[PDB]
Amino acid sequence: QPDFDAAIVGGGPAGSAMASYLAEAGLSVAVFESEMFPRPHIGESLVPATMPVLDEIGVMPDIEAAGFPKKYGAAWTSAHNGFTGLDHDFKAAEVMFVERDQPGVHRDYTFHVDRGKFDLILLKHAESRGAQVFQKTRVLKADFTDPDLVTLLGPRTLDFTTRMVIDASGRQTMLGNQLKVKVPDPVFNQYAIHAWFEGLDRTAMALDPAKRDYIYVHFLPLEDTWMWQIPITDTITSVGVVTQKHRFKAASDREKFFWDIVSSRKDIYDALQKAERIRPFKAEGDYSYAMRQICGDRFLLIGDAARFVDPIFSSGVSVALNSARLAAKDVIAAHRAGDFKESFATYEEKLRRAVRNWYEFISVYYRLNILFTAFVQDPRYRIDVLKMLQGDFYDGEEPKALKAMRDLVTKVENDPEHLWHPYLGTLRA
């Protein structure tokens, strides 16, 4: 007599994807979302590992019809020790996703996206495939009896019953907090400040005007600080700064600080000065964490609710989408067999490994800093580095690039006369 077979907390990319998979499989599914869509949300530039999932669940047409800017590649700018391919020294690197064959991907492009629209399309698509979706409905607790009662809408409180809970709460980590298994990263503590601008000329930063719809990461000449530049429409562009919380606390105000930091680079500063900010400044903080358990009897965690690290590689949505995919296979087998913790270990193992790679790849980047440019551009490393940049880490093998980069960061770190020793970033793992 439970209301649902599964209940999903949160309707972002993880939640919507999960529900859509579960409904196609024949389960009674509910999705609870405390907001009303469309709702603004950070995390806009996708990587091609999103696409197989979006195809599989049958939403690509609806995505294609939305008119999001296509993303053909990614670029880095800023302002040799045997490395080559460096046509522009360390002021520019570029890569195109099609340079490497990626399994499950048959296109040249993915998308940069207004998350408001993007999440709405996935959430309505979940409804079209059978899921019961409940907006402005906040889940307060999962009370663990033979099912779970979820306790939840305006002045009214209501309960619903499920055999299984799936936490897709993102950074609000509902069950992570409820069960007290959330662990903040002992090193990463970056802080993001961002906004949307209209009329920035994306040709400014572009070496070649065909590449101006790439994502641009702009390294700044401070410690562990950079900026993103992401197309949202022809005319609107999402810009954000990322730095250490300590820097932000070392200073005194969100706007003033954003511009101060951007002021470290004249060209971009002036370029942004030609634009009109179309949205208030929002901040993201305390977002690097993991969980000691990501599953238990009658629950599991997907998307940012299970982990998040740092958005330097634009992979968060692909992780949310692919964690949903993997978790579905386990939830479906558990439902059929009538048995909901150890039922979820395959999902756990495959996500632990996947996310270790992303993590370890990010730690290198920060130690490497600007030297990272060299690995994009040098052809011994370019294609391996691109595997990671594609979001492709759901494989047995340890990525070859991560080994090479780690080994090389070590040798540089230990040797104070190494040509690159002065260019090391200052955040370590």
Ligand X SMILES: Cc1cc2nc3c(=O)[nH]c(=O)nc-3n(C[C@H](O)[C@H](O)[C@H](O)COP(=O)(O)OP(=O)(O)OC[C@H]3O[C@@H](n4cnc5c(N)ncnc54)[C@H](O)[C@@H]3O)c2cc1C
183 assigned ligand-binding residue = no
315 binds Cl ion, rule: CB under 5 A: yes
Structure tokens at 137: 């409905």
165 assigned to a ligand binding site: no
Q: Does 311 bind Cl ion (CB under 5 A)?
A: yes
User: CA distances (Å), 393 to each of 46, 200, 232, 254, 388, in order?
Assistant: 15, 34, 27, 35, 7
The binding track of 200-239 with respect to a second copy, each residue x by CB under 8 A or -, is: ----------------------------------------
Per the omega criterion (within 30 degrees of 0), is the bond before 38 cis? yes
| Token pair for 351 | 């996500």
Spatial neighbors of 115 by CB under 8 A, at least 6 apart, are 40, 41, 42, 43, 44
Q: Which does 240 bind (CB under 5 to 8 A by kind): Cl ion, a second copy, ligand X, none?
A: ligand X
240 annotated as a binding-site residue: no
At 10, is the secondary structure helix, strand, or coil?
coil
At its nearest, how many Å lie between a second copy and the CB of residue 215?
Answer: 23
288 marked as binding residue: no
Identify which of residues 34 and 315 has a Cβ nearer to Cl ion in the complex.
315
Candidate list 80, 106, 136, 266; residue touching a second copy; CB under 8 A = 136
CA distances from 324 to 76, 91, 137, 281, 320 (A): 30, 38, 21, 31, 6
**Given the complex with Cl ion, which of 315 and 323 has the nearer CB atom?**
315
Is 367 annotated among the ligand-binding residues? no
Q: Which of 68, 76, 118, 160 binds a second copy (CB under 8 A)?
A: 160
Under 8 Å between Cβ of 357 and 403: no
282 makes contact with a second copy (CB under 8 A): no
Partner touching 134 among Cl ion, a second copy, ligand X, none, CB below 5 to 8 Å by kind: a second copy
Can you give the binding site for ligand X, defined by CB under 6 A? Answer: 9-15, 32-35, 41-46, 138-139, 168-172, 174, 192, 240, 284, 287, 303-305, 308, 311, 314-317, 320
**Strand boundaries in 39-189, DSSP class E:** 70-71, 73-77, 92-96, 110-111, 132-134, 141-143, 148-151, 159-167, 182-184
Which residue, judged by CB position, is nearest to ligand X in the bound state? 303
Q: According to the annotation, is 415 in a ligand binding site?
A: no
Q: Residue 240: name the closest of 273, 275, 191 by CA.
A: 191
Listing DSSP states for 75-89 in one string gives: EEE---TT----TTT
Which residues in this chain contact Cl ion in the complex, by CB under 5 A?
A: 311, 315-316
Binding positions for FAD are 11, 14, 33, 39, 41-42, 45, 115, 139, 304, 314, 316-317
Which residues in this chain contact a second copy in the complex, by CB under 8 A?
A: 3, 30, 36-38, 67, 120, 124, 127, 132-136, 153-156, 158, 160
